[PDB]
Amino acid sequence: SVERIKTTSSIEFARLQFTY
Amino acid sequence: SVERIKTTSSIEFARLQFTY
């Protein structure tokens, strides 16, 4: 089966992850 | 008297508050 990945417009969660 | 609450499109101030 085939699907589409939905991407959030906000990367700041991952940047907060990196900083923390 | 009634009014409408205006919400900012950016939540990262509160997330920075939490992390800090």
Long-range contacts of B11-20 (CB under 8 A, 24+ apart): B12/A10, B12/A12, B12/A16, B15/A12, B15/A13, B15/A16, B16/A16, B19/A16, B19/A19, B19/A20
Question: Which residues, 6 or more positions from A20, have their beta carbon under 8 angstroms from its beta carbon?
Answer: B19
- Expt. technique: cryo-EM
Tell me which of A8, A9, A10, A17 to substitute to probe the interface with B (most B C-beta atoms closer than 10 Å).
A10
The Cα of B16 is separated from the nearest Cα of chain A by a number of Å equal to 8
Could you write out the three-class secondary structure of chain A? CCCCCCCCCCCHHHHHHHHC
- φ, ψ of residue B12 to 5 degrees: the values are -65, -15
Amino acid identity, residue B2? V
Nearest to A10 by CA among B6, B12, B7: B12
Tell me, yes or no, if A16 comes closer than 8 A to chain B by beta carbon.
yes
- Residue pair B19/A20 in contact (Cβ under 8 Å)? The answer is yes
